[PDB]
Design a protein around this ligand. Structure first.
Ligand SMILES: N[C@@H]1N[C@@H]2NC[C@@H](CN(C=O)c3ccc(C(=O)N[C@H](CCC(=O)O)C(=O)O)cc3)N[C@H]2[C@H](O)N1
Ligand SMILES: [Mg+2]
Ligand SMILES: [Mg+2]
Ligand SMILES: [Mg+2]
Ligand SMILES: [Mg+2]
Ligand SMILES: [Mg+2]
Ligand SMILES: [Mg+2]
Ligand SMILES: [Mg+2]
Ligand SMILES: [Mg+2]
Ligand SMILES: [Mg+2]
Ligand code: NI
Ligand code: NI
Length: 196
């Protein structure tokens, strides 16, 4: 019953956040994304990190396009999500240029990812990750995160520990509209939430 009340609070907050995210203009989402891109590019954990996981942005997320271009300009090794919907499991798989992204097939969320038989280097098979850009629907200032529901990033963070001594730094990228007083939890916290 306590579990269910937690789920109910998460669901209600998701509906609130989604409505705000729906209510934002394309131009404005683009403005806050530009502000975050400059913040990330100046960020010391980003500047020092060699192996990075970043997401490919949905319409309700901070746009990561400029960060990706910077990643490859700085010769960082870049991994993106590859989600297997049948088992609710995600890996982070290597891409070798920003331009490759444009040729990939897309999922039912209209996001690019390498297809089923494209054999890819996985981040945990070749060293793990220094830094993971964390998407999500909401975050509070304690670093709690409200994801879309099925906990694929929480599960992936747990998995990272099985390959690395040092846990990846987790940096969320949020609209100011996505910052909440308290995210209902219980769930993995992020190290830092960036917003305007
Ligand atoms: N740009 C990135 N790409 C990432 N790629 C992997 C991915 C998985 N994903 C798709 O790639 C995905 C989306 C929703 C649910 C789930 O948790 N949600 C529905 C309710 C959400 C809907 O009604 O709006 C349900 O609980 O199943 C699980 C996996 N999540 C993406 C992430 O959220 N944003
Ligand atoms: Mg809604
Ligand atoms: Mg409200
Ligand atoms: Mg402007
Ligand atoms: Mg959406
Ligand atoms: Mg360097
Ligand atoms: Mg699949
Ligand atoms: Mg992996
Ligand atoms: Mg699909
Ligand atoms: Mg996993
Ligand atoms: Ni897998
Ligand atoms: Ni608090």
């Amino acid at each position: 019953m306590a579990a269910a009340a937690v789920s109910s609070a998460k669901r209600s907050l998701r509906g609130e956040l989604k409505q705000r995210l729906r209510a934002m203009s394309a131009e404005e989402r683009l403005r806050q994304s530009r502000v975050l891109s400059q913040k990330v590019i100046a960020h010391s954990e980003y500047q020092k990190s060699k192996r990075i996981s970043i997401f490919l942005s949905m319409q309700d997320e901070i746009e990561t396009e400029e960060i990706i271009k910077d990643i490859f300009q700085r010769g960082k090794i870049c991994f993106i999500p590859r989600y297997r919907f049948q088992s609710n499991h995600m890996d982070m798989v290597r891409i070798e240029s920003p331009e490759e992204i444009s040729l990939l097939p897309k999922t039912s969320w209209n996001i690019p990812q390498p297809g089923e038989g494209d054999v890819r280097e996985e981040a945990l098979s070749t060293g793990g990750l220094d830094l993971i850009f964390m998407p999500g629907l909401g975050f509070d200032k304690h670093g709690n995160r409200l994801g879309r529901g099925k906990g694929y990033y929480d599960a992936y963070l747990k998995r990272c520990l099985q390959h690395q001594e040092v846990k990846p730094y987790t940096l969320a990228l949020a609209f100011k509209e996505q910052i909440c007083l308290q995210v209902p939890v219980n769930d993995m916290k992020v190290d830092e939430v960036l917003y305007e």
